[PDB]
Design a protein around this nucleic acid. Sequence first.
DNA 1: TTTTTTTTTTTTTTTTTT
Lengths: 437, 437, 437
Amino acid sequence: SPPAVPQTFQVAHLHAPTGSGKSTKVPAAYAAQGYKVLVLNPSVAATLGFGAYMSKAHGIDPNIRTGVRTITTGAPITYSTYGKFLADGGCSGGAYDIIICDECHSTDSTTILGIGTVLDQAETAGARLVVLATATPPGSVTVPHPNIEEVALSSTGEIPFYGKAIPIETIKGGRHLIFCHSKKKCDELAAKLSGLGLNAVAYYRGLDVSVIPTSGDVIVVATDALMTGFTGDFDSVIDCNTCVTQTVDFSLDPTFTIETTTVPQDAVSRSQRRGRTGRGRMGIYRFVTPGERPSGMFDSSVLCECYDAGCAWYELTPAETSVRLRAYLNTPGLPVCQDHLEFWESVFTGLTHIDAHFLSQTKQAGDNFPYLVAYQATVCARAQAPPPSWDQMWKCLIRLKPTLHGPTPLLYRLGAVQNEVTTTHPITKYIMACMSA
Amino acid sequence: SPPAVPQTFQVAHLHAPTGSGKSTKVPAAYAAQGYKVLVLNPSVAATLGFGAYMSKAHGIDPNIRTGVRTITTGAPITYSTYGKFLADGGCSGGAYDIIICDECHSTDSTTILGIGTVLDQAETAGARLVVLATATPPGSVTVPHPNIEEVALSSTGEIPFYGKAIPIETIKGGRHLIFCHSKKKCDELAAKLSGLGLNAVAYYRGLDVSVIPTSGDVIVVATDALMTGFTGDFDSVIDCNTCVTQTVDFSLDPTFTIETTTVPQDAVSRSQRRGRTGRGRMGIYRFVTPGERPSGMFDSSVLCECYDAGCAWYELTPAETSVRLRAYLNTPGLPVCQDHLEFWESVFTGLTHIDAHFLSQTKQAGDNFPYLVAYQATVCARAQAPPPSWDQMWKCLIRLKPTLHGPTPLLYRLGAVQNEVTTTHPITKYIMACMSA
Amino acid sequence: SPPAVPQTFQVAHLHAPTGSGKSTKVPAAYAAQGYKVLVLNPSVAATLGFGAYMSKAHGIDPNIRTGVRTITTGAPITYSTYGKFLADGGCSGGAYDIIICDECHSTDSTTILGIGTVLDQAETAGARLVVLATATPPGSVTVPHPNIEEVALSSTGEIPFYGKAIPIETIKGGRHLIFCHSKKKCDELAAKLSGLGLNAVAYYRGLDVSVIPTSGDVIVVATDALMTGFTGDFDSVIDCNTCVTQTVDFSLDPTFTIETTTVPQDAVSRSQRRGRTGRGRMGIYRFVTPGERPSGMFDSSVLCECYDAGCAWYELTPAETSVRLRAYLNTPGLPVCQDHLEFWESVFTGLTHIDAHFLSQTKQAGDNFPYLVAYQATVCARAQAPPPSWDQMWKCLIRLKPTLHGPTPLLYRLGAVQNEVTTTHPITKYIMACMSA
DNA sequence: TTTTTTTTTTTTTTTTTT
Ligand SMILES: Nc1ncnc2c1ncn2[C@@H]1O[C@H](COP(=O)(O)OP(=O)(O)O)[C@@H](O)[C@H]1O
Ligand SMILES: Nc1ncnc2c1ncn2[C@@H]1O[C@H](COP(=O)(O)OP(=O)(O)O)[C@@H](O)[C@H]1O
Ligand SMILES: Nc1ncnc2c1ncn2[C@@H]1O[C@H](COP(=O)(O)OP(=O)(O)O)[C@@H](O)[C@H]1O
Ligand code: BEF
Ligand code: BEF
Ligand code: BEF
Ligand SMILES: [Mn+2]
Ligand SMILES: [Mn+2]
Ligand SMILES: [Mn+2]
């Protein structure tokens, strides 16, 4: 199955079910042929997990690169998150022979930006083979997994769960993973369970991977933070079947609107979440709702998110970000999306001289679109105007409340707007013009 | 006055004037007898308020449950909003001995749904006593309050107010609460006052309770968001005496019409609004219009609103919602309403496969009947037809404007209809048939 | 031309052709002299339009007040509709030095009520100068406009239009405004044109001003909603030369009759409609019928309409409305009308205790004389009698159809009467007596 | 059959990863 290493640059695909070994066996086999391999994964939990596992199961301590930890052993295999890969400047000269873009079904800005970067610097960097691996390629439907029994949940059960219920004897003893669409529910559920006599713990972006015991009975309640790549040796998985996504609406009021919505999971999500169990042994998968929506395409808001990440986290200029997204969108076999690069690039190119103090605050707060949020805060402060509203999202301005007054120079809509609004700010006019043509 | 805890399940009533302590002293006294008590209140502002107050006045940090915050201390008393109670799945097995349905005069869908839920799961959950508390029972007239002087407003005053006027020296210094029937007026009035040298602030569903200072001179302009349960230590209250309500009209054109109207407040509203002052000390109540209309009965539109909330917010099937409303309507001592359960249940049972993206948008927009609005949007999009009109209510479809064409498949009337209309859509025919018999 | 600001109160007139700048340059020049200016305009479209224009053409973001939007910048100029002015309580103490009553040729109840209010509170409010501005004073004939070529329409053309025809090449490309006497024709025409390949859109009271693009080729089909104050940068205007007006007939059968009729436009209307083009550049004006009827006087039905508006929208008692209309009728240079204040005041003074639910419904339905309509509905319901007929105007009673029976207690005639009629109701007898002397 | 303008205008509790 693994693509043979060609004598000249080449991008190939690798498709195999969840748990088959695309992230472990494959890269090992390549190393065995005397090749230097880099494996990029979107999950921090999974990346760190390869360190320990590859150690005691393949006798090879690989190099590990993540925001949390770094281990340089000098082995021929390196596991890194896409995020850490971008923050390190991308490809190194003659650093690797093969680069494996793992979980290339991920449609988060960092993975898109990362894979684009690879597809744009790989050959020049001296790599002979780039591999796009995933168990759920762009246009694919959920297929039965040999190790996973799929059992729907009913209304019987002492624990309420998205309309259905979870029977305690179903998670009393053993290792189990419960997917919840938001951190808030993860917290409540984990609590509900702990207050029952169960060893429950919650996990999501922001918490420490150590919270998950390597062994022993445990019930982990998490978000899509544990959706891909991760192996937690779970006997079962309970999926709410819902997910949080973002959409962009060009409502010209005055510019665009980025709305976060909770919707039914798509095929990719269902297969990946299900895939957290049945890894090297039989497992059970319990769900709330059957079926799902098709995949293969992602919203233009994701592109917006890439420019924002490029500007806020990876010191990439809009132009530079374009070159990378272009490589991605022009490569066959990946998720497709409306070509709005020019538009988004021209938008962000206008957002200059942002307040560093504000940017820093929205990044550390975990805000979505930290750059756009902070930029709007910047514009407001400079106009001594209040933010769109006074909710958490704009706390970085509460400190100026006594001086701020008048209408808000709305640049775009990132949430609810309560204060009066003015649409005459230069940037607003510039964005509208970027939309008119 | 407080009902004694029986040895077997029993639902009792508790009626006492506003500010007497039904939501604080009573639940404390029960806890003192070694009982676990749950207090459900419709107000988020009031619920959070019990946290701090019960702390420094009854030396007992209770558990707090609301959409905004959660505090699990482990105390024998828990304060929760009806909304948060429903979103948590309802009653917990052997979680409480007594459940107090506070402010059971509230006729909003969430309170009705909540109380029904309690009256349907309480005994089975192991509760021995359910208490229905309020200062304004179903068929009751406004009675004089010992701490409140009622002074009508006149035409003298620099601030215009619903036909009358408010004298500045009447609110210059001290703490005051001004009731306005809509957020729009709350905003204008608060502005008018701030631009006078007064510390004014507006408050309604959507803003943050923190906007109201714990102490110091302040003038709060709010909607019925601060009508019940809340204690803000106000020296006075100024009431516009008007309120926003909803009505359903079975106009068979083609189906029904839900109309929002501004009308004179009823007795319940007058006593509750008045009751925001005179809490533990003398207070003043100024009004625009005297007298009021009788209470005890609510419009069938409220039931419609419950099914819609059940479907949009609490993951309840129409059938499940019916079981809860039935418990409510069959319990003596509560507000009565036409028994249209069967009808409304059959209506919503037909509205399936709604677009999640649309539902999500109408919920976050605060639209009334978010499910019906979104469902109509769904039907339109699927027929590539435009919405009833192009006002804010249908913005979620503006994005398809270029493709939408032809007449609107009107399912029912939720507002003004400007575009041409077709009444042949399956759902429309189904609704008409639900009405014919 | 602009009246100099006197040291003591004074009401002056300002007459200048359409598009000369009475609503923009003039108020700016006053602000330049360190004066605070309020500009009242009857059009919502025009008012919002001043916001953007004054911004990028006079570098001054003015305060904007309308039902749809509010922008408080703190500038020395404020633009407001008469409607919004009345709903805010009228004049503010020492809020402005100059009040400019724009488009004082408008004979709609709101403008009349508004200007009367100003002429009655201005001095007391501390204003030094009240200005009555218009391009078409009371007794004035249509005069040639230097920027407008007037070209009659013929029978040649593919688009039928009030007896004549419109040649497609006359509106194919460019910006054009077409006046139609009713919303129904606006809809059909706009459709007819869109179904030809033209970017056509309809506009009238009720739709959103956003429907009109700021630029690009467009054909707007509208009612007198775009008759005054508005600047849409149109290359031409096509006028049907007809308008909808109302008349009152004291037919003593039993009381009066208010009839809506379609008639030939008067001079004011022709000059104002023509004035939508040729604003800052040459334009074309095409018409169906030449000439027109003289202006300067309006029907007693307008006064009736003021009391009704005062009662239904501006919380004004008949007595209060009289004080304002009196100020209007006693001020030289404005449109004159029969002095029937006493009569109309005594009529409305009798209409008390109207059903709020009905009033609310006729207001939201856009009915003319919403108060009188709703009052008649109220009387009927209280007598368990059916309405005058069963047409749209009385839909608010269809819901009682099964209980209503007998003759209709006709209070007056607002339309066709089909059901049997009784003239013995107290209110009817009271109205007749108000007419007898 | 064919057929009517213009400006004022709506609350409450559930709720978002990567
Ligand atoms: N961190 C780990 N802990 C325990 N087992 C692991 C771990 N990583 C991999 N494995 C084992 O190796 C198999 C292949 O894992 P992996 O390469 O991650 O699969 P995938 O094809 O999904 O990328 C799994 O089925 C599992 O049994
Ligand atoms: N949050 C609070 N802040 C200050 N005082 C409070 C608060 N809550 C309750 N109180 C005091 O306790 C009394 C009883 O309050 P409460 O139980 O809420 O009354 P009710 O009978 O209306 O339910 C009030 O009159 C007031 O003096
Ligand atoms: N909203 C607008 N958009 C474009 N031009 C405008 C606008 N408002 C005013 N103008 C320009 O300024 C001139 C004066 O407009 P205005 O003050 O409204 O005239 P009027 O004398 O009719 O009240 C117009 O001829 C036009 O060129
Ligand atoms: F396909 Be494996 F779950 F990364
Ligand atoms: F009766 Be209290 F005001 F809740
Ligand atoms: F006289 Be302008 F057209 F208001
Ligand atoms: Mn993998
Ligand atoms: Mn209470
Ligand atoms: Mn003008």
